[PDB]
Amino acid sequence: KPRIDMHSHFFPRISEQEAAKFDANHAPWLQVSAKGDTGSIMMGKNNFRPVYQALWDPAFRIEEMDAQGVDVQVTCATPVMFGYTWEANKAAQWAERMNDFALEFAAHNPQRIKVLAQVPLQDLDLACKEASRAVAAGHLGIQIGNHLGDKDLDDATLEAFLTHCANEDIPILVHPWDMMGGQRMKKWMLPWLVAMPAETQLAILSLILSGAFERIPKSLKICFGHGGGSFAFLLGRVDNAWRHRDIVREDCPRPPSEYVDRFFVDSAVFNPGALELLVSVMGEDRVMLGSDYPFPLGEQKIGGLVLSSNLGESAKDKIISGNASKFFNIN
Amino acid sequence: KPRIDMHSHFFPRISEQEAAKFDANHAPWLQVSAKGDTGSIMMGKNNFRPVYQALWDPAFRIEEMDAQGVDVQVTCATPVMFGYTWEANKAAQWAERMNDFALEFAAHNPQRIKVLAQVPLQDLDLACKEASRAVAAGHLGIQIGNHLGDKDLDDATLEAFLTHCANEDIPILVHPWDMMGGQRMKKWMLPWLVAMPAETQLAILSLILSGAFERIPKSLKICFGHGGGSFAFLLGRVDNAWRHRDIVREDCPRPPSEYVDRFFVDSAVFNPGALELLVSVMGEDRVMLGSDYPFPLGEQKIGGLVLSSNLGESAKDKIISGNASKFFNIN
Ligand SMILES: [Co+2]
Ligand SMILES: [Co+2]
Secondary structure, eight states, X not given: OOOEEOSBOBOOOOOHHHHHHHOTTXXXXXEEOTTSXXXXXEETTEEEEEEEGGGTOHHHHXXXXXXXXXXXXXXOBOGGGGOTTSOHHHHHXXXXXXXXXXXXXXXXXXXXXXXXXXXXXXXXXXXXXXHHHHHHHTOSOEEEESEETTEETTSHHHHHHHHHHHHTTOOEEEEOOSOSOTTSOOSTTHIIIIIHHHHHHHHHHHHHTTTHHHHSOTTOOEEXXXXXXXXXXXXXXXXXXXXXXXXXXXXXXXXXXXXXXXXXXXXXXXXXXXXXXXXXXXXXXXXXXXXXBTSTTSOSSTTHHHHSSSOOHHHHHIIIIIIHHHHHTOO | OOOEEOSBOBOOOOOHHHHXXXXXTTOEEEEEOTTSSEEEEEETTEEEEEEEGGGTOXXXXXXXXXXXXXXXXXXXXXXXXXXXXXXXXXXXXXXXHHHHHHHHHHTTSTXXXXXXXXXXXXXXXXXHHHHHHHHHHTOSOEEEESEETTEETTSHHHHHHHHHHHHTTXXXXXXXXXXXXXXXXXXXXXIIIIIHHHHHHHHHHHHHTTTHHXXXXXXXXXXXXXXXXXXXXXXXXXXXXHXXXXXXXXXXXXXXXXXXXXXXXXXXXXXXXXXXXXXXXXXXXXXXXXXXXXXXXXXXXXXXXXHSSSOOHHHHXXXXXXXXXXXXXXX
């Protein structure tokens, strides 16, 4: 019955000086206001996002984990630090620095704080090395964006990197980023409410419908962020469109809704009816408690939705604890 | 207990000659293969989509409605014919021609076939006239795309056109079209499975979060196509993000999940767990049987999902019959 939060974010103590070493416009860095209890993520010289002390001060973060019942948390890089847009070596150097930063982070109570490494996904080689280097170095797995410009998970680049980690028993977190839309969704944080779930839901079908779960070893432990996005809902549509149009069946040989046993999703759906539906489509043994701590939109009572539910008692424990522990190899 | 299908599509007997009158590249037209039992929608000279005889031959369509139990169907223009991209008068002339075509269509058994008019939404004036002209001419309401280039339903143009129809008791169907994504979702009909639900779900929040349901008279009967898209699922997230970020609350003064009494959705979700969830968020009196007949992805047993459900007996009738009849004023 320890409680494991497995989606969560961090950001390292990088000065504006160090970030200009890599790119004075597109590297990010952390800027603390005098007090040391607020601050903002900065893109070169612009204000990207306000954040608060939980995102860099792990000592503070353990106090908070105590006040929510979180025994073990898993953190990992904030989407922004991914820089998949960059030159392929500077990025592989950037990523080795972060996973190094992140490792000192969990080095504050590594029995409680577990990290997940980012990669330089543009070059397929660098990333395969970076991921096995940083999983031996300490991490429990890798966190990647769900798409690479116009390359979704179907692209053989990303299939390859997956099939590498399936073999090395390197668990994988896929996290939406670099949202679609272009111009239209500018106001009200729409990009987080419509684009983001849609991006994850796209990433999943980009495997099932490309038939990648037929070529990728069944060892692959892969989880998708924000409850799979609008998936467990839109599934019924995908099955229907596969029963009825040839060119949907083209490379997917079973009915899509059969591959719900090849991946996992977290619980971050924020609604007890949503969660029920989500579990029935995924199976009580494939949904894992995540919170998206500390960002503003991630349930401040971590676990609350899961325990304020109708769910069974075995189920509740599997999400909270079981599933995540089997997933990451936590004792 | 008559059964009313209220989402459905048609396309008129337009020759390639007539379509060049308006645009030899972007007007569409219907081309029948010799037999008169198959054919294809054509953009000038390209093959847009294959279709089958149900989409133009209403005599045939009544035979089919007999073999599904459909007593009254409501059809309306196929997204493609919208031409919101066009010069503003040619479009208002195009639209008056279609709603005229469509009227002869339902003029085959108008006690069974009911139509819904399209508009030239780019010019706000033309459309307000076109819509009251064609609702007196015979139609039961208007069907519009959910967005206008980069203008979503929040844009005051489209708020205005809504507030006009709320007053004239002109019911409204919002149908996704002109999907987002740009380049990435090219293969496997992804655009129908990820973009399309996302577009409808965006259109709905573009009202709630803009606060438009506060300025728009409560008379407004408006329905959203394809079960609201990934809405009833992602709602829990929207509420959460409104409880927690100021700039989401900026123009929305109640918690978003309260406006589920200002619109309706059809049933086209294709999964009994999806439908259950959809009804609980919308209320048995706000979900209406639709089928997306005849396009390939619209359940060939019309009503099957609704009656193959756990739902109550009053509920089942309200979706099938009740709600739609109150919605369109059908006796
Ligand atoms: Co996150
Ligand atoms: Co449709």
